[PDB]
Amino acid sequence: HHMLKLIVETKTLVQSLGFASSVVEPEYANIKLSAQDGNLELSSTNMDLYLSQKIAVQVVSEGECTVSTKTLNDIVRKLPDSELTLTDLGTTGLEIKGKNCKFNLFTLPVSSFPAMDSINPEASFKISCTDFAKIIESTKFSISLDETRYNLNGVYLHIKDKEFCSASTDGHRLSISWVTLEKQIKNFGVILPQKSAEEILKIVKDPKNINEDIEILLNSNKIKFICNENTIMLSKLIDGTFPDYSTFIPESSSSKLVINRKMFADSIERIAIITVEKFRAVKLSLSRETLEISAVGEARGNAKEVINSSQDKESFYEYNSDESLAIGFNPQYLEDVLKAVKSDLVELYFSDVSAPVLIKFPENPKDIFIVLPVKV
């Protein structure tokens, strides 16, 4: 009687199953399906993360059931119908039905599926999905992967005056990206695990969400994202203290490079080919007239590219110092930064061969990157 039955647009179900799949990364994972009040609610969870998604469907009968996430994902992606019927048939299973094809998936008791934890938040605020995607995109790549340094295995989400900021570091580089809030929020500082950051970023970037807003609710132990009303993610937070990164930002520089971003990234990538693992270094030999990007690989060879001074936007190179500077970097850390912001030009602020480079993008005043050099 109270068995779930609904008709759903296949493309929409496929999108939801994609998000439900990636958060529990598989054969043991179950997805809860709940048809109520004109919508289907799809829930996925593990020890760290809980995702609830609601999509509009034609609810023929209200009810709930749970099935294998992977099997449901694999099946729906291969049905050709533009709409599917989902019907809980009891001992027969959950029936997924198109025009000519029927799959029965065995169900597991809904009583075995946990409800989303309650949160009683200490801070609550809303920002655009465009702004939130920006700050995660600009910081997720420089998270520490060293699972021992647990306080660095995520992004540091914090308030500074009216700025909502994300910072990340792995010891070799620092990334900072922020957006101005209109409201006066209490100062907080929490560390969002890498996986949660990756998953929420894909959610806000979805075409249905990117032009809308995301509500953020948090306390010391958990954070809740409500993305465009119908998608809710609850994540644990890392118990740790993020370092005071403010002292890591260079306050002065003795030379400045302005260069076409894509030209610089492509040249670094080309020259880095010759290097060997654990010896990943490219040398930037900077002068007013030319930049030489070079590298060596033991028992492989060496490589050099020359970039000439140019005021043409597509090949732009300007280095306004009489002194030459030869400074080395891990090419991956430069490439990560150059890929993170879509900009014609990039600015690099230097001191000596041992001091970090400050990297900025001219039209992007709320993104800052610091990268340490290597000796070359």
């Binding site: 340094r149 660095l152 570091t169 010891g171 620092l174 370092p243 890591f248 970090p356 340490l372 000796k375």
Partner: peptide, 10 residues
């Protein structure tokens, strides 16, 4: 290969 002044690790 110098690191930031993080004091566990550097």
């Amino acid at each position: 290969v110098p690191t930031l002044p993080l004091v566990p690790x550097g």
